[PDB]
RNA sequence: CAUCCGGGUGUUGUCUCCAUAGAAACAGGUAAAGCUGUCCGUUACUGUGGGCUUGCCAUAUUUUUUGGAAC
């Protein structure tokens, strides 16, 4: 269905994750899976305490993702057409 | 590389005899078609 | 489960609780159960507070939050 | 349903009719389906 | 008004550039992302249907094309969109390299910008095929069922393996088994097996089969392409549990037989059976052909509604047999998304881009992304002006930027000087390749193929395009080799103006010929005559036509 | 090499102890029945909280998702 | 097998639901999906005040209740009222059924 | 091993036969030149049906005498002009 | 490549002693031998002892247990 | 204030401005573009609103104003597993 | 795996032989169970139905739960007539003597 | 460079054959006509019945819907 397809149609753009643990990650979406697993590159990261760091590359399990932020351009991608 | 209907191979080999230095090396029976693929050679000066 | 890029690198691994562990990844499956090597509980400041866990270690996949290829 | 009307301007047949007309037309119909037949015997080669 | 009918059908007015079905700005917005661009070279033998395959992809991308006559909408005549030179229209033949940039979507709904380059199929235009191989990441090798894997296909496979590009094969003109040769379906399955086995004989280690979706079946006259994955997605996936789909897909080829929900690797005893591909794929295609040509229309539309969920309009039901067959097949086989999925799944950059770059340049470490670095593949006559076909291999290029151009014929000595001076140009205009138009843009990015209007005077045949910000960047710079045109020129004409007064015009024109035709060799004798070497008689006919008709526009004597 | 479902099948009519995931609670009782989802029915049970024996109970049904571990007691 | 299809019978009843977080939801039942997703109209949400006053547990529930957009200034005990709500099936603990229902038919 | 529902069957399996009685005629008509590949059209004037034209656009039978051959050639001259 | 469940089996056949970590319950680990393994990673542990989080001195013995897969964080050598 | 027909399903609410609750007590407000089997949601021009602990105590029982914090988010996919309940805020304009 | 009719009869077999048969005995006997819920509430009620997921329509409900006001601790005793109960919230069912 | 024999499409008018429910009751207006308004038939919430553009029909045991919760 459309939301998993939008997360696939987001690959190669910069996305922002928030997790159940309260961490936040922002970076280039290298790969995404139908299970909502994602891999990010050149990742700005943030702790639940609000402390900030940077890391090269990450993988995240789908179940722990709270929401994903996608570039506003995609509202006119061909995915949403009837 | 010559593609021709199989019963007309005598004409093709006659032409390859008329041209100087030309020779036929292999004939491929193109499966499931009436065609043959005939592989050979001819000099460039003779190719006009 | 596209872990192939990591499949013999040193991976740090967030797990349920708040307890980072780390090791050389050795294998994975459809649930993200992971098996990893030279396994260390990363409890804190390394020279006394961490713990080497054993020659083999395997994780039930639901317990992984996230992982990082510190050696790319 | 075969012709637009008595002004007799447009027609539309079925497959059995067109087959029967084609079969009757054997003397005066063309039967050269192979387009390569007209190599150097066509309009533009005559022009050249 | 400038008019171009004497040389090419081309759209001069921006208001008449056709509207895409997709939003075109969205396609540009993903040009920034190298992972979203695939460059596809459509190569294959003479008359394989490559331009027709492109005609399929062009029509499905646009709302209305001004050049569509009703003969083309109804499918009596091919559109031949990319064959847009007057000379190509007259010969019925692709002569020069053309292409289009299209937003394409796979069976999973993910989009790519795809740049397609349509190589000429005639054997004497193999220079253009070499340019296509150089430019392309993946190659669609189009072959027709009838002649199949010929020696030309063998060499195209070999050159593709040499050029480090992903091969994908389109088996075209399946109607010719059904309608021309009139094979019964079992014999047609055996024919396709013979073709696919012959393909595998020359692809050294890599295995090609339909269940791997490296094989696409097509009839670009009747407007359809399909893969096994595409067909089961459209018409069988809804009728089995979703976990079974890929395993059902895996069993639709080879020596597999089926009966009442059970499979075997041998035929069943009590009833004689065809294989699974024949039962589930090929016999339905044969039945679509037969019934669309010869069933009563009301029964036909009832069958199509019950089976394929396609409704026929009243105007479509009035169509003649070949337009109606095309219309029904196009309703059934849905916009070529399984071809885009095959292209998508067959090419992995991780295994190929480094090898391709190391083949076209010297081997070494990766280019720093602070540097612009691009391959100027050829000079092209496109519309009212010449352009340079460029693949951007790294960095960004901006409109109006000042950039340095080195001809590839100097690359070897310059590289030896690297291990132990270049002219510069302003990039006046940049435009996407659009077939019968050029769509202007302000930027071009890594992995993209694009036309560039300013740099064409700094090289003859091909060039390296680069821009740097540090002397250390210059020390790390790689230069592209002179390009391997597959056939050596051995067919010679000696050439002289009819009136010696007109010699300088011929000199300008011969420079233009040497630029535009990649494989041609032009040299001047001490006798004062000009010597042209070409691949063969049609090649010489084409370039001498260009000399007389477009470029020199004078009378020219020639030897036998 | 005894597998989990055969082990619980063997444990029927034996006096087992089950500690829950919550409230530091353990039930000790005779195992009556078990299913594919490892739900438990026990008889003549007793409730222990942190090891203090609250009171004995009749028949008991413990839902599968609540258990931490099951053990056989000394018999 | 049967018991989600029991809930599907209950259309237009003024059922009353307690979510796992502890908030109580009165309203008119328009639909129940096969995944137990329930739709209510003419809905009143509430948190019972003996539970509510322990902030440490009920902060999440209170914050959610206010951010519905339907909490008026507190006449009493943190009531909200809204025309339409969709509730995820997993989130339900209890459904109090209407007192007049003839369960023996179902 | 792998299996699927017992009533699963291919597309268009309810219609038993592949070749209908008219299929041979439809295949013959499909390849014919104009107008026989059509099933609709506009009426033409009777004087606009060039019946004999298709003969001399093609090569004559080689055995024909000289007067016939030059007749073919001259009619081609008229057509080209 | 070693599949994770095959590694669990390689704990099982060699009968090697191992330590197991609970899911969200931080303050305990469990030591013993893996006797049984599963499709859902339920495990049967013999000579089991729970140990706090620090060492074997403070532990208390459990006997033979079935530990339900929903609670396993780690298995370690 | 908005009123929507008793025709029950979420599929009718495409392009309506939803406000969507989650297990952690924030609310996401945006135009619904799509929904899924799992109730994964796509909200365009999205806003997350959240009650900080500094004024969370003002909701305790005793003319009232809460200074809630608001956050901009772009075209959010929301994981259905987290979504607590859904309310409709405005019709498509 | 198995056919639909076989799964139907298998559900009947499981309800009679399996651990769920404690609830079935109370349902058929029309005698009240006691149910410790996940939120430490204890329902006392008569069962009218149940399913695979341990959801259960209840009637004649009484619902004990406890609260504390500083040092003091107090009981609440709500009565309900007819109640659906989602099965995931169930710790442990009893059958009273 | 023209003439001639013919052709397509659109609009409007006219002619021929064949037709009817209706509120075709009334007013405004244009290069034309519901172009526009008052108006009329019934339907928007249900019980019997056809079709699909959907969901259950396929899911309690690791990535969503059968709670690591409760404090
Ligand atoms: N029967 C049949 N004919 C086809 C099919 N596809 C193309 N053709 C015909 O084949 C001829 C060649 O068409 P092109 O599309 O130009 O083929 P090409 O591969 O581009 O050949 P080049 O011009 O040499 O590059 C045309 O007359 C087409 O009508 C097909 O699928 N079936
Ligand atoms: Mg071509």
Numbering used by the authors:
A (entry chain d): 5 to 86
B (entry chain C): 865 to 912
C (entry chain g): 5 to 76
D (entry chain A): 291 to 338
E (entry chain C): 97 to 516, 533 to 672
F (entry chain f): 12 to 86
G (entry chain h): 1 to 106
H (entry chain A): 451 to 531
Published text:
This yielded a cryo-EM reconstruction at 2.8 Å resolution for the C-complex core, showing complete base separation and base and side-chain rotamers and allowing discrimination between adenosine and guanosine bases. In our 2.8-Å C-complex map, we observed a new spherical density clearly separated from adjacent phosphates and bases in a position corresponding to K1 in group II introns. This ion interacts with 3 of the 4 U6 snRNA residues that provide ligands for the catalytic Mg2+ ions, including the ligands for M2 (A59, G60, and U80), as well as with the third triplex strand (G52), and is thus ideally positioned to stabilize M1 and M2 binding in the active site, as does K1 in group II introns. Using focused classification, we identified a subset of particles in the C-complex conformation with extra density on the same face of Prp8RH that Prp18 binds in C∗. The α-helical domain of Prp18 visible in C∗ was a perfect fit for this density, which also accommodated a small peptide of Slu7 (termed the EIE element) that is known to bind Prp18 (James et al., 2002). The conserved loop of Prp18 that stabilizes the 3′-SS docked in the active site in C∗/P is not visible in this subset of particles (Prp18CR; Wilkinson et al., 2017), suggesting it is disordered before Prp16 remodeling and 3′-SS docking. We also observed density corresponding to the Zn knuckle of Slu7 (ZnK) bound to Prp8 in this new intermediate.
Following assembly of the spliceosome (Wilkinson et al., 2020), branching occurs in the B∗ complex when the 2′-hydroxyl of the brA attacks the 5′-SS. Docking of the 3′-splice site (3′-SS) at the active site (Fica et al., 2017; Wilkinson et al., 2017) forms the closed C∗ complex, which then catalyzes exon ligation, when the 3′-hydroxyl of the 5′-exon attacks the 3′-SS, resulting in mRNA formation and excision of the lariat-intron.
